[PDB]
């Protein structure tokens, strides 16, 4: 989930935007 | 600000700025 993709590895805008409503 | 390790409030802040008026969901246990 978001922690694995953006906290314990480097985040990206592509990934972050998957969590916008 | 997005292309780094972002945890906790730092990650919520990034979601807040990127998502804007869409809002977002923060589901750390999923
Ligand atoms: Na904003």
Author numbering:
A (entry chain A): 1 to 21
B (entry chain B): 1 to 30
What does the article say, verbatim?
Here, we present a novel polymer-based support and an associated deposition method, with the aim of providing ultralow-background conditions for serial data collection. To assess the quality of structures that can be obtained from chip-mounted crystals, diffraction data were collected from a range of proteins. These proteins included the insulin, thaumatin and HEWL that were used in initial tests, and also TD1, a tubulin–DARPin D1 complex, EcR2a, a class Ia ribo­nucleotide reductase radical-generating subunit, rhodopsin–miniGo and PepTst, a bacterial peptide transporter.
Our initial chip-deposition tests with water-soluble proteins showed that direct deposition of a microcrystal slurry without any cryoprotection, followed by blotting and flash-cooling, was not satisfactory. Fig. 3 illustrates the positive impact of the addition of a cryoprotectant on the loading of insulin crystals onto the chips. The number of insulin crystals that visually appear to be surrounded by solution is markedly higher in the presence of a cryoprotectant. To correlate these results with diffraction data, microcrystals (<30 µm in the longest dimension) of insulin, thaumatin and HEWL, in their respective crystallization buffers, were mixed with each cryoprotectant and loaded onto a chip. For the insulin and thaumatin crystals, 25%(v/v) propylene glycol produced both the highest resolution diffraction (1.35 ± 0.03 and 1.76 ± 0.09 Å, respectively) and also the smallest mosaicity (0.12 ± 0.02° and 0.22 ± 0.10°, respectively). The same insulin, thaumatin and HEWL crystals were loaded into the different mounts, and diffraction data were collected and processed. 25% propylene glycol in precipitant was used as the cryoprotectant in each case. We conclude that loading crystals onto the chips provides sufficiently similar levels of crystal preservation as standard mounts up to a high resolution range, allowing the low background and high loading area of the chips in serial crystallography experiments to be made use of.
